[PDB]
């Protein structure tokens with residue numbers, strides 16, 4: 001609705017909806033469904049020193065959208 | 066010649082059974098093909114069928130022992146390999162002597178379970 | 189009793205560290221539990237904290253020796269085991285005496301590190 | 312000087328390969344660094360290259376013997392170290408003479424592959 | 436042997452195996468009654484809810500103390516750990532006998548309930564710089580006292 | 582005697598190695614048995630994603646013709662000891678070296694290799710903690726990063742591993758033609774008789790609005806990734822259970 | 836080096852019908868329902884399927900014209916020829932309808948309506964409403980509105996039956 005005007009892409013909209021749907025699942029099945037949303041990942045580039053400089057091209061969590 | 070052939074077949078089946086044990090404990094029992102399942106069942110019967118009650122242990126273990134003649138041994142194992150005794154329960158071969166003992170113990174098991182059904186059906 | 193308990197705890201940890209050293213070789217230190225890593229960190233500090241420069245080996249080492257009192261050793265090693273000195277750099281425990289000398293090398297280590305950072309910052 | 316420098320270089324890599332071979336035995340080749348694999352490949356080619364069929368062992372080897380000149384050996388091993396022959400198959404260095412023999416066995420091997428791919432196409 | 440480099444699964448065999456290994460730690464020889472009773476308690480799962488670190492303290496209280504008498508809850512008529520002459524009765528009559536089985540289970544159940552209710556509850560609530568050391572000294576003393 | 586002492590130490594040391602690795606096999610055996618459920622529950626999700634980006638095409642014209650950035654998103658594990666799965670991917674990338682080629686790999690061990698073997702064709706890579714079943718959000722993050730790396734990218738090529746049977750693992754590729762040129766090809770599929778399988782499907786997309794088409798393109802492109810990353814995991818556990826048995830028949834020989 | 840295309844592994848291609856072909860009267864529709872790359876139904880013959888797209892609801896029956904639908908968070912119904920109804924709830928995705936008699940509904944998340952709970956939705960709705968007032972910026976407000984709308988749709992579906 002109003003998220004398009006703010007530049008939010010459709011894929012991010014899908015991720016938020018799925019996360020909300022998982023949060024609405026019962027406790028028993030939440031053990032499985034909630035695993036299908038948790039964004040446990042990052043984006044890194046190795047630098048000269050070897051440190052994995054983290055990138056900020058795209059937010060990882062929904063709250064960062 | 067028959068004795069040698071039977072012995073080799075048993076050894077081959079046992080070796081295959083060990084290989085199938087590794088697979089079922091890796092991919093799952095359901096992953097075995099139809100032939101493999103039959104081999105597993107026959108091999109397990111062979112392993113159970115290799116145990117014998119010794120007459121020396123009658124006093125301690127109570128169960129009467131058995132002296133299996135060689136002629137019976139070859140025929141008993143030869144029949145099992147072919148698949149004639151594919152309907153006998155596995156446990157009927159455990160600590161029995163000869164093919165006839167396998168059959169009598171099957172009667173005593175089938176008849177024993179008959180009472181259990183009439184009980185569980187009733188009550 | 190404190191001396192006995194501390195000594196036993198030190199030896200037990202260094203026995204565990206030997207086992208975990210193998211897993212760190214087959215697998216990596218990134219595949220260990222959150223408690224195993226803590227044992228590894230403290231154990232590595234214990235190994236280095238046992239070193240001591242002797243007053244007679246100044247030529248060999250080039251540094252003045254230390255004479256550590258009995259009570260200082262018991263207190264210092266007990267603190268490392270319970271996690272008190274967990275934020276101290278590991279190398280601050282190498283070739284030092286009591287914890288008071290560990291903390292002075294850490295400050296010296298931190299100051300030089302700050303100087304290096306300042307030099308890098310100007311570049 | 313070239314003879315000494317090349318000979319030393321060969322032994323240096325044959326020493327590197329022995330150390331690497333200890334890692335390779337347990338874990339495997341895939342558990343090596345990117346440059347380590349290059350060293351392994353060159354060393355393996357060196358090991359194969361050192362072999363030579365003698366004129367007296369024709370019966371056992373079933374192949375005509377070779378007599379490699381000193382200059383040819385030095386120049387041939389120099390290239391293999393430089394990487395100039397990194398595109399030649401490994402088995403082209405086995406039981407050969409100089410680099411000329413290497414580059415001919417490679418040709419025959421490639422041609423024989425055409426009798427295994429053209430035949431494959433005919434079968435298909 | 437199959438969980439050296441992975442998180443273990445807390446099954447009944449492992450829950451009791453760990454206690455058995457812990458119980459074997461001892462400095463002085465144990466009287467037969469004390470040893471057999473402690474093994475029986477661990478064998479039937481009375482120590483499943485007891486942490487491995489507190490096993491020695493639990494055994495010490497069972498042997499050298501009596502929680503039931505302390506809180507006025509003991510109901511057994513004769514089976515008490517302070518009666519050192521029960522050893523020969525246990526030797527003659529196994530613990531799995533109607534003469535002693537009924538009271539043995541009652542004592543173990545009551546002792547376990549009291550220990551969990553009073554002692555282990557306070558242990559899990561220790562948050563200080565001196566209490567932690569005092570608890571550590573206690574456990575070490577129990578390790579080499581029983 | 583020292584020599585006897587040395588050999589005895591070596592033997593037990595190798596025994597300790599066989600034990601720490603026998604455990605790994607049991608672990609990766611579980612992560613593969615549980616992960617074998619996908620084979621029965623797959624191959625129908627992407628049916629219409631075929632009609633989108635299933636363009637049987639040559640490997641030369643598609644490469645030379647493009648003059649804009651060609652994004653590549655190889656998938657790699659973040660841990661070693663998985664056959665040659667991670668190794669073959671690098672070889673495939675090397676065979677497709679080009680001026681416009683760019684790499685945005687996945688995994689710690691993919692970052693380790695592509696970073697140094699292609700310094701001139703590297704922007705950054707993604708990593709995934711394997712405590713989560715590969716989910717859509719992870720795929721979206723990869724897609725969003727790929728677009729920002731090169732929005733004016735001719736194509737995005739994802740190279741992952743496919744698991745046919747328990748031991749037959751191959752390398753597979755998903756091509757995602759950039760929307761701008763996908764719209765142009767959807768035009769030919771709607772008018773010319775050429776492209777008959779994609780005539781109806783193309784027309785239905787045309788009848789709808791453009792935003793829906795853009796959402797469609799992003800959705801199935803993301804869904805394609807959800808198969809790419811999701812499938813490589815299954816191949817990973819296969820190789821890590823095929824080269825952890827090869828490491829246990831070499832320890833037993835030593 | 837002929838990289839096998841990933842789609843080639845999937846031999847279950849889509850059956851598209853030519854325009855000029857003669858008509859066939861179909862009595863069943865092949866439904867293919869997918870969640871997060873996991874299908875729940877494999878070309879299952881059904882009598883009809885009801886799907887709530889953006890513009891409105893759609894009742895797809897065999898022979899429905901070829902179309903593409905952009906779904907919205909809502910329930911989905913499947914009625915078999917036997918006379919049995921099965922209801923899921925989807926959070927989004929696309930539905931492809933083919934004139935040949937196939938309908939592929941690939942959703943990001945498709946879960947049984949039974950698995951959902953009412954009280955959980957109510958408390959979550961209240962929390963989102965409370966957080967909406969404290970929204971950090973416009974983007975947060977839109978996100979909360981999206982979450983609220985999904986919850987309201989779930990509650991409405993549950994209260995319907």
Ligand SMILES: O=c1ccn([C@@H]2O[C@H](COP(=O)(O)OP(=O)(O)OP(=O)(O)O)[C@@H](O)[C@H]2O)c(=O)[nH]1
Pocket residue numbers: 788789790890
């Ligand atoms: O102003 C406009 C114009 C067109 N459209 C959209 O463009 C498309 C034009 O396409 P059609 O004219 O074929 O619509 P339709 O009859 O299939 O519509 P439905 O019953 O399926 O809803 C339809 O999807 C319409 O909603 C708008 O949304 N707004």
